[PDB]
Amino acid sequence: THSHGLFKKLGIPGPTPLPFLGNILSYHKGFCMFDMECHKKYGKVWGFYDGQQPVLAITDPDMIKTVLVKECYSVFTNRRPFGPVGFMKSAISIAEDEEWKRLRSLLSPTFTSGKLKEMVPIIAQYGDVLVRNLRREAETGKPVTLKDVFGAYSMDVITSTSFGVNIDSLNNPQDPFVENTKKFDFLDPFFLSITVFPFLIPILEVLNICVFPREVTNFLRKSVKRMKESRLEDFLQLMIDSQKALSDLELVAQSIIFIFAGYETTSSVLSFIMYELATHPDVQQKLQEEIDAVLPNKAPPTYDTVLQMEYLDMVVNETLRLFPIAMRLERVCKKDVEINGMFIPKGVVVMIPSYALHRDPKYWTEPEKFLPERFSKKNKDNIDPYIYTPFGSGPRNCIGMRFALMNMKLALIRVLQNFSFKPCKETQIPLKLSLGGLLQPEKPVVLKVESRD
Amino acid sequence: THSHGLFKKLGIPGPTPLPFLGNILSYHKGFCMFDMECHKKYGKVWGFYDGQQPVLAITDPDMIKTVLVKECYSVFTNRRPFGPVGFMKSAISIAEDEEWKRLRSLLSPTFTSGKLKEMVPIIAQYGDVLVRNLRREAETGKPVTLKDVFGAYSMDVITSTSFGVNIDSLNNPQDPFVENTKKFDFLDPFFLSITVFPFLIPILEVLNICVFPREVTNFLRKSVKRMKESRLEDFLQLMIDSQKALSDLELVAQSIIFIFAGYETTSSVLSFIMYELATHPDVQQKLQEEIDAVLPNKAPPTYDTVLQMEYLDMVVNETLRLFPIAMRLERVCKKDVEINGMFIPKGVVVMIPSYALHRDPKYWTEPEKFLPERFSKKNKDNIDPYIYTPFGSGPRNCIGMRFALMNMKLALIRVLQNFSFKPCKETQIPLKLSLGGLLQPEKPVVLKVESRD
Numbered sequence: 053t054h055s056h057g058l059f060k061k062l063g064i065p066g067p068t069p070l071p072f073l074g075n076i077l078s079y080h081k082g083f084c085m086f087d088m089e090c091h092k093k094y095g096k097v098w099g100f101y102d103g104q105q106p107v108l109a110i111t112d113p114d115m116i117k118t119v120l121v122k123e124c125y126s127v128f129t130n131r132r133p134f135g136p137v138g139f140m141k142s143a144i145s146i147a148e149d150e151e152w153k154r155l156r157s158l159l160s161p162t163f164t165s166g167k168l169k170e171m172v173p174i175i176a177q178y179g180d181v182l183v184r185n186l187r188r189e190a191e192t193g194k195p196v197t198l199k200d201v202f203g204a205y206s207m208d209v210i211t212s213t214s215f216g217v218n219i220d221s222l223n224n225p226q227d228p229f230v231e232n233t234k235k236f237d238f239l240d241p242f243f244l245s246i247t248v249f250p251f252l253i254p255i256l257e258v259l260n261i262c263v264f265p266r267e268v269t270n271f272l273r274k275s276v277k278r279m280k281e282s283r284l285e286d287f288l289q290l291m292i293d294s295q296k297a298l299s300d301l302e303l304v305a306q307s308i309i310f311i312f313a314g315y316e317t318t319s320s321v322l323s324f325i326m327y328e329l330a331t332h333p334d335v336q337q338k339l340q341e342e343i344d345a346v347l348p349n350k351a352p353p354t355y356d357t358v359l360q361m362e363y364l365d366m367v368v369n370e371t372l373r374l375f376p377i378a379m380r381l382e383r384v385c386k387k388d389v390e391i392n393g394m395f396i397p398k399g400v401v402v403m404i405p406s407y408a409l410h411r412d413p414k415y416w417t418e419p420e421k422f423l424p425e426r427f428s429k430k431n432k433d434n435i436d437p438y439i440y441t442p443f444g445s446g447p448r449n450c451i452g453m454r455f456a457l458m459n460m461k462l463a464l465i466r467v468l469q470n471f472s473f474k475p476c477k478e479t480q481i482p483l484k485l486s487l488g489g490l491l492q493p494e495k496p497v498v499l500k501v502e503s504r505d
Numbered sequence: 506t507h508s509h510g511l512f513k514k515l516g517i518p519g520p521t522p523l524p525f526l527g528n529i530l531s532y533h534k535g536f537c538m539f540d541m542e543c544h545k546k547y548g549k550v551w552g553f554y555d556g557q558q559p560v561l562a563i564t565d566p567d568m569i570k571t572v573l574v575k576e577c578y579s580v581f582t583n584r585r586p587f588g589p590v591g592f593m594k595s596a597i598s599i600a601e602d603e604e605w606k607r608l609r610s611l612l613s614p615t616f617t618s619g620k621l622k623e624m625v626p627i628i629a630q631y632g633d634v635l636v637r638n639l640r641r642e643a644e645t646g647k648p649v650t651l652k653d654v655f656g657a658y659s660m661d662v663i664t665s666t667s668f669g670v671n672i673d674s675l676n677n678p679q680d681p682f683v684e685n686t687k688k689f690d691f692l693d694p695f696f697l698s699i700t701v702f703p704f705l706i707p708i709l710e711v712l713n714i715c716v717f718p719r720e721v722t723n724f725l726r727k728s729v730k731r732m733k734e735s736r737l738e739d740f741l742q743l744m745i746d747s748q749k750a751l752s753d754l755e756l757v758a759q760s761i762i763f764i765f766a767g768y769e770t771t772s773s774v775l776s777f778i779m780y781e782l783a784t785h786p787d788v789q790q791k792l793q794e795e796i797d798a799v800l801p802n803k804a805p806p807t808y809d810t811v812l813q814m815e816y817l818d819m820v821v822n823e824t825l826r827l828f829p830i831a832m833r834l835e836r837v838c839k840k841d842v843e844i845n846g847m848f849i850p851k852g853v854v855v856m857i858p859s860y861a862l863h864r865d866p867k868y869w870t871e872p873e874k875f876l877p878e879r880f881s882k883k884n885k886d887n888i889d890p891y892i893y894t895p896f897g898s899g900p901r902n903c904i905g906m907r908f909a910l911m912n913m914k915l916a917l918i919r920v921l922q923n924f925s926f927k928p929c930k931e932t933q934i935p936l937k938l939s940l941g942g943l944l945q946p947e948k949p950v951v952l953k954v955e956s957r958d
């Protein structure tokens with residue numbers, strides 16, 4: 053436990069670390085509550101130890117921008133390593149340094165205005181599928197779980213945009229391309245034990261053990277294999293028309309990330325939005341009127357249409373403030389440097405507590421409140437872009453931001469053009485966040501669902 | 506590698522062990538071929554090292570009987586430990602010493618003549634289900650995979666005899682009690698690495714890591730929980746009417762063993778029998794005539810009926826000779842002893858190569874040949890019961906032998922009363938055993954299936 057003296061030696065405040073454990077015991081109410089408290093009592097900057105691993109939390113907007121934007125390329129290029137990952141070492145959000153910049157550049161042109169617009173008609177054909185699957189249980193007239201219906205849609209949109217495999221996942225709880233997809237709590241019996249035994253990570257790699265257990269990976273290594281080639285002899289088509297090289301084992305890796313980034317993220321965030329609309333009927337009514345004014349006769353949405361609806365964009369943005377699913381942003385400092393006057397030694401994980409910053413009184417009137425008006429053009433300047441970062445910032449931000457926004461909103465428009473949502477008995481008000489290690493509802497989101505004519 | 510001198514020090518022949526690896530590299534053609542060769546060139550007794558773990562192979566019938574029967578209770582009580590197993594430490598085939606004898610005695614009355622006879626009508630109702638599912642693909646007229654149809658049946662018979670949950674598993678590739686059940690190669694990237702790093706086993710236990718990965722276990726911990734009690738407020742009923750205590754976490758453990766012991770074992774052995782019948786039509790015809798003579802008009806079988814058909818018992822026994830799915834029997838020596846004149850130090854795993862002994866010319870005319878006549882009452886005395894041990898022997902033999910025999914034969918009778926089996930093009934002749942670490946067909950068993958009227 054010789055590494056625990058670093059934050060007194062640097063004169064930086066923080067909770068006292070226990071031997072070997074560090075501050076991990078302070079995670080008993082999730083990263084979010086521990087960040088909000090630390091912020092409230094330690095101020096602009098503090099430190100703590102994930103095991104032996106020092107973690108410096110910063111909150112200065114000039115400092116955050118130095119880490120995310122300015123000195124990203126030179127100093128803060130990687131996220132904190134975690135394992136074991138096996139062949140997934142080559143995935144973009146996990147890769148580091150020069151083979152990240154290789155993958156980041158190779159994969160950036162997959163989320164371009166021209167390519168995103170070229171996906172509107174394809175996934176608009178699933179918005180319709182979302183409607184009929186949702187109409188059936190509107191006459192059922194008993195509470196509806198959104199994570200499952202949104203999952204099916206978001207999954208349907210992923211499979212299609214990723215491999216062209218068109219399936220009604222709700223009505224097909226079966227077929228091979230939806231079974232494995234159904235198959236990371238940083239605080240379960242396991243990931244706690246790898247922050248207390250980070251020295252055990254090389255042991256599990258030698259054992260080919262993977263946190264992505266090798267039953268799902270093997271399905272796709274061949275599901276892509278035959279469909280790489282002898283099934284067509286789309287993110288995939290846009291990676292083979294360039295297959296700075298790109299191995300086919302490295303091609304499977306990015307496919308998995310895209311699939312999880314946008315099935316759990318897209319549906320979790322869509323569930324948080326329908327909760328906030330159902331417990332704020334005022335907003336729901338305001339949004340149904342904006343949608344119908346841009347799209348008369350329940351018209352099909354287009355790329356240009358969606359960038360226009362700005363109360364819809366206002367609603368999405370505020371939900372992300374209250375529920376930024378990443379919670380934190382993390383960069384590993386690559387060398388002895390000194391930003392904003394303070395000194396950062398080699399190896400420290402520099403951390404940014406997105407959740408807590410999204411709820412700081414020193415920036416947000418009525419923090420816990422759901423006020424989509426904060427983001428209207430009248431007020432969307434009193435908002436620091438380095439305090440509101442649900443997609444990160446800088447070269448290593450969310451490569452799928454524009455697609456995530458565009459997909460969620462297309463789901464929202466076609467859904468609100470036809471249905472409305474009311475709180476139930478099982479409906480939890482106010483929603484309590486997970487005690488665990490990600491940002492999901494403690495109890496699933498289930499609501500009343502009526503229909504218009 | 507200080508432990509590798511033990512077999513020169515004892516003056517016992519064997520292959521020379523490499524540092525750290527031992528003789529594991531000699532497993533490149535399965536345990537079976539390595540046992541047959543060692544036997545052929547080293548004789549009655551030899552030794553080798555699974556990593557640092559010395560393993561003494563014996564073949565004397567008086568010696569085998571001393572280890573399995575005489576000094577089982579005092580010296581050779583456990584099988585060689587393997588892990589990580591988590592809560593499955595309390596399962597009977599894994600438990601050791603005084604808590605094994607507790608579980609062995611507590612669970613023995615579940616396989617009694619009176620209880621086995623009380624299962625005939627229940628599983629005879631599934632023999633019928635086996636027929637109709639098999640009739641459909643008799644008119645299809647294209648090769649039939651037996652492991653899948655036998656799996657469904659054997660599974661149907663397990664679920665019912667274990668929890669009363671009656672399901673058509675082939676026609677239900679779905680329901681929760683058949684999904685997880687579908688979910689151990691001692692030679693994959695993993696189990697090789699735990700015989701070279703047996704010192705890493707305590708590491709994975711600390712991590713709650715299990716070779717029974719915790720997705721299946723958790724289903725049953727609660728699937729039994731509510732059906733323990735508030736679903737009826739059968740092996741299960743026969744364990745709760747006594748729930749020397751028996752914890753409920755220990756109750757889930759035995760349930761898993763029974764389920765795997767008799768879904769993969771019962772269906773693997775049934776697939777080996779239909780292969781041997783289809784490539785020996787003579788025997789198949791001889792068996793169809795014995796069945797029809799005991800059971801006229803395709804009559805339903807009974808407990809007394811099955812013990813009577815002795816060519817059927819002859820066919821089963823010979824298949825087990827050629828394919829004894831356990832391959833080896835193993836006991837861990839608990840103290841310095843000296844049996845049959847030779848000296849056994851503390852800690853050595855004493856091993857018996859069932860497969861190779863089942864194919865030894867010094868006991869078996871035409872070893873590779875399928876001659877069910879070896880087991881007729883005319884010849885079933887020229888057969889040493891410590892050379893033919895498909896169910897082991899002694900206090901720690903197969904507790905489910907009588908049930909396994911009774912179940913397989915009931916499957917065989919109702920099937921042969923209605924169908925016949927012929928070799929195909931994809932049919933592999935002769936069958937080649939798995940290069941891997943268990944005894945299964947290298948390529949699945951698929952055969953032509955006709956029908957009688």
Ligand code: HEM
Nearest residue numbers: 144145310313314317378442443444445449450451452456
């Ligand atoms: C509501 C939806 C989403 C949210 C809120 C979100 C948020 C984030 C955040 C905060 C980061 C970290 C940024 C940083 O470190 O500064 C990130 C990274 C990333 N996201 Fe997203 N994301 C979403 C959807 C998606 C989708 C749909 C995809 C892909 C199809 C995606 C792909 C990625 C990738 C690849 C990275 C790692 C980037 C890198 O390391 O270079 N995300 N996301």
Ligand code: HEM
Nearest residue numbers: 597598763766767770831895896897898902903904905909
């Ligand atoms: C064709 C079917 C089967 C074969 C060939 C077979 C064979 C064997 C063999 C060779 C052993 C080791 C005996 C020894 O160590 O000397 C064994 C152990 C065992 N078998 Fe079976 N078995 C079969 C089916 C079953 C079934 C259906 C069950 C349970 C329902 C079962 C339960 C067990 C148990 C619990 C043990 C461990 C006994 C102990 O450690 O006390 N087996 N089996």
Ligand SMILES: CC(C)(C)OC(=O)N[C@@H](CS[C@@H](Cc1ccccc1)C(=O)NCCc1cccnc1)Cc1c[nH]c2ccccc12
Nearest residue numbers: 143145146236309312313317377378379380381450490491
């Ligand atoms: C919701 C969230 C992001 C907070 O937790 C997650 O469940 N996922 C982790 C684990 S890692 C992995 C994702 C994964 C997880 C389970 C099974 C397969 C793959 C990966 O390779 N990619 C992440 C894809 C993604 C998710 C959300 C937004 N965009 C991109 C944490 C994490 C991974 N990448 C990050 C980037 C920034 C901040 C946090 C993370």
Ligand SMILES: CC(C)(C)OC(=O)N[C@@H](CS[C@@H](Cc1ccccc1)C(=O)NCCc1cccnc1)Cc1c[nH]c2ccccc12
Nearest residue numbers: 596598599689762765766770830831832833834903943944
């Ligand atoms: C076919 C065989 C027996 C050679 O390989 C096996 O796949 N199973 C191993 C692993 S262990 C486990 C079984 C298990 C395996 C996978 C998933 C869950 C549980 C256990 O707890 N019970 C074994 C039940 C059984 C199987 C066959 C006959 N009777 C009883 C080896 C093994 C376990 N027990 C033995 C007893 C004697 C000889 C070998 C073994």
